[PDB]
């Protein structure tokens, strides 16, 4: 049962295809427009059927050519209202038929962000992007909102003409729209079944450059060269990815550069990766991010999660396959402090929440659970560490990839469990299952808190950075002369990244220790949002002052959650800057990207 879901489920009848015809209204911020779906029953005698929709307004529902009856129901909070809609003629099982629903988007949706043209970089043209996962598709479009489903789509949207509309999919031309002509129309055609989450669209002033035989960028004008070299790895990732996992189906492999509120550092939208402009420092250091949506075009977009509570098996797999990407590229040490870093990833989040929360286990119950409230790290890590506790079990990475690369061509184009998974775990290893009956899957999988087993890390890259680390925790005021600019010579900018991290997970430190760190290291200066995140968390729970108007503006001048949310929490625990915090939110939240909005409302408690 898809616990996120209104919608009759996949047992009842599945969508095959939508044909989405809209407009894209800017004075009213509303996407106006029809959504056909092909809906195939698998049911004998079937006369009616439930869609998700959240703050949509319905016109119509016409089937054979007539007007049908459909009814909404009381809203559900989150998971906004049912539409049950009454079928002109009881169908047979496997029998299709085509309903056509007349909608609009409220300006609410929390699918979309809309941006007047001064929160873009041109400040001529404003702008509009979406964000379906988990369960936002049904703020755009009336749909079985459950990623149990997939269906493959085309569309045609109508946007001013200076503007360019591009989506999810293969872009298929574009035309005057004939009934306006200030208007362009531009259409795009998905072959590929898809979950519905991995619909996306976005509406701007754009222009790409290409960096790859398959491969553009694009963004607004003023961040496309930047762009262009920030992922000039993006097809040697590919090539590796399609090593470990068989062939890339997608066709193209696009990114698109968002403004700086898009709340994710990527999201694995078909054929046009979204990403954080936050990841633009200039050195190509965060590309890892790109390798991390790169490998979702395997584990995610081609095997996907049949419900929102095996969150893991998208995120783990991804991010197993993501490290090793970065270990073929840069090396199997790099690997393995990556990995070792997501440890310390995990251990963050499980004291944040508490190691007896239940958003702490691997597969999550969701009922009654919103999923954005619930995301956290936790699939990731959790997730990751086991597949990295499974490859040491048995026999190393060359083994283990032979059945993560078995384990997609298996459940290609399909939707699928934790159970499912580890059935063709059994099946694949059979030769070793006594290895895997010594496995603690109980815990692994449904127990809270830190897992059971630690992996082994190789700490190469990582011992310059704990004894740093240390070196400062337990420096007194008189060893502080003896740090100085040199301490930092062979690091790199991963390395200081994890030097603060580590110092991080032991704040306070005393105020002149984080004072002669500026005046010897001038973390101040640092652009790399990684590091500037960290950094800054470090001067505000240590409690400098100085601090505080640097904290604000990364808060609130990018609006990457990852960064915002622990940004305005950690400002809001800090007495000295609380009531700026909440003043500032309060200020920004019109101009906020919904869901951020909500959850930075949520951390700091305020409505
Ligand atoms: C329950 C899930 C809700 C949040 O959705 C999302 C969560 C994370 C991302 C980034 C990435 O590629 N990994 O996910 C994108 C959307
Ligand atoms: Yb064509
Ligand atoms: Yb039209
Ligand atoms: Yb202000
Ligand atoms: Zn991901």
């Known amino acids: 049962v898809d616990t996120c879901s209104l919608a009759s ?30 809906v195939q029953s698998q049911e004998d005698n079937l006369r009616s059927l439930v869609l998700d929709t959240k703050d949509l307004t319905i016109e119509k529902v016409v089937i054979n050519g007539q007007e049908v009856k ?40 929390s699918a979309l962000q809309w941006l007047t043209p001064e929160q873009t970089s041109g400040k001529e043209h404003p702008y509009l992007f979406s964000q379906c996962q988990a369960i936002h598709c049904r703020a755009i ?20 003409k200076e503007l360019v509309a591009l989506m999810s999919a293969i872009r298929d031309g574009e035309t005057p729209d004939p009934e306006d002509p200030s208007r362009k129309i531009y259409k795009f055609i998905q072959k590929v079944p898809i979950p519905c989450y991995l619909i996306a669209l976005v509406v701007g002033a754009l222009e790409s450059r290409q960096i790859g035989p398959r491969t553009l960028v694009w963004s607004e004008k003023e961040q496309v060269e930047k762009s262009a070299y920030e992922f000039s790895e993006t097809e040697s990732m590919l090539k590796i990815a399609e090593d470990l996992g068989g062939p890339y189906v997608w066709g193209q492999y696009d990114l698109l550069v968002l403004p700086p509120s898009f709340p994710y550092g990527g999201m694995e939208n ?31 977009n081609l095997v996907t999660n049949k419900t929102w509570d095996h969150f893991w098996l998208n995120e783990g797999h991804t991010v197993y396959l993501e490290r090793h990407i970065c270990g073929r590229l840069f090396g199997e040490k790099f690997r393995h402090f990556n990995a070792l870093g997501g440890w310390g990833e995990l251990q963050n989040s499980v004291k944040t929440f508490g190691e007896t929360h ?78 895997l009956n010594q496995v603690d899957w109980n815990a692994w999988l449904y127990s809270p808190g830190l897992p059971p087993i630690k992996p082994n890390y190789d700490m190469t890259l990582t011992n310059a950075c ?41 704040a306070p430190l005393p105020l002149g220790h984080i004072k002669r760190m500026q005046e010897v290291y001038n973390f101040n200066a640092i652009n790399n949002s990684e590091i500037r995140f960290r950094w800054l968390r470090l001067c505000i729970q240590s409690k400098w002052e100085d601090a505080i108007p640097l904290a604000l503006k990364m808060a609130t001048e990018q609006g990457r959650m990852k960064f915002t949310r622990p940004l305005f929490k950690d400002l809001a625990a800090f007495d000295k800057s609380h009531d700026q915090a909440v003043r500032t939110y309060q200020e920004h939240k019109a101009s906020m990207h919904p869901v951020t909005a909500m959850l930075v409302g949520k951390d700091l408690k305020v409505d």
């Not at 809203?75 to 038929?97: C, D, F, H, T, V």
């Not at 991010?289 to 584990?299: D, F, G, K, L, P």
């Not at 502080?480 to 030097?499: I, V, Y």
């Open 270 to 300: 078909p054929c046009l990766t979204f990403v954080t402009p936050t990841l633009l420092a200039g050195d190509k250091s965060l590309s890892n991010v790109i390798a991390h949506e790169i490998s979702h075009s395997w584990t995610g």
């Open 466 to 506: 704990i004894a740093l680390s240390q070196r400062w925790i337990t420096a007194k005021e008189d060893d502080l002369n003896s740090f100085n600019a040199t301490d930092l010579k062979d690091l790199s900018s991963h390395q200081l990244n994890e030097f603060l991290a580590q110092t991080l997970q032991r």
């Open 358 to 435: 239940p958003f702490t286990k691997l597969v999550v119950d969701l009922t009654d659970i919103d999923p954005d409230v619930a995301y956290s790290s936790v699939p990731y890590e959790k997730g990751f560490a086991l597949l990295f506790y499974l490859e040491q079990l048995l026999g190393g990475p060359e083994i283990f990839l032979g059945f993560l690369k078995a384990y997609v061509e298996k459940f290609s184009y399909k939707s699928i469990t934790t159970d499912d998974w580890k059935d063709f775990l059994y099946s694949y290893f059979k030769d070793k299952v006594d290895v």
């Open 70 to 109: 459909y009814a909404l129901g009381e809203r559900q909070s989150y998971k906004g209202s049912p539409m049950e809609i009454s079928l002109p003629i009881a169908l047979s099982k496997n029998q299709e038929i085509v309903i056509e629903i007349s909608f609009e988007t409220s300006p609410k949706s």
């Open 141 to 160: 479009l009336p749909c079985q909102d459950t990623p149990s489903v997939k269906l493959t789509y085309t569309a045609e949207v109508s946007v001013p």
């Open 9 to 38: 489920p996949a047992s009842v009848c599945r969508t095959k295809h939508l044909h989405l015809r809209c407009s894209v209204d800017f004075t009213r911020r509303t996407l106006t427009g029809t959504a056909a779906l092909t």
